[PDB]
Design a protein around this ligand. Sequence first.
Ligand SMILES: [Ca+2]
Length: 176
Amino acid sequence: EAIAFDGRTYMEYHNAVAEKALQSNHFELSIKTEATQGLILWSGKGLERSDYIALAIVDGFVQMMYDLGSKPVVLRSTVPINTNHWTHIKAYRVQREGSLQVGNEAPITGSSPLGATQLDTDGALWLGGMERLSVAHKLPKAYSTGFIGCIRDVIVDRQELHLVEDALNNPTILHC
Ligand SMILES: [Ca+2]
């Protein structure tokens, strides 16, 4: 079941099986797009003070960004994502270290600054864009740009995410 996004489509989900302290994050999914800029996924409370970890298309390539409390670190892929062809994306973080693998490229890795190791969230996860966009002039434009393309087989922390009935904001479902 592939879902389509037209640039104004954003779905809200909450972590499946309070204030939680997460030591790790695991994201898998496939996407299809022609976009050079766009927010794919944002996990965090979404507030100015909140920690986060996100996936986005910045200037033609997928990149992973996260701030656990000691400033953000970015991991940028070397694969052009706007081929309009389905492409797999494997992303994970264990404490400070992270890995981003788009397609069959060699995994790009890195560590966020010394300090925080936990992502403090309430379980919120956004797809295609995010409600609280207080970042239009605080991060690259891609992060406040709705995604345009398709997404399928999304797996979060080893658990399959059901794009349609798991959504909470009763969105307008359009398939690819
Ligand atoms: Ca933290």
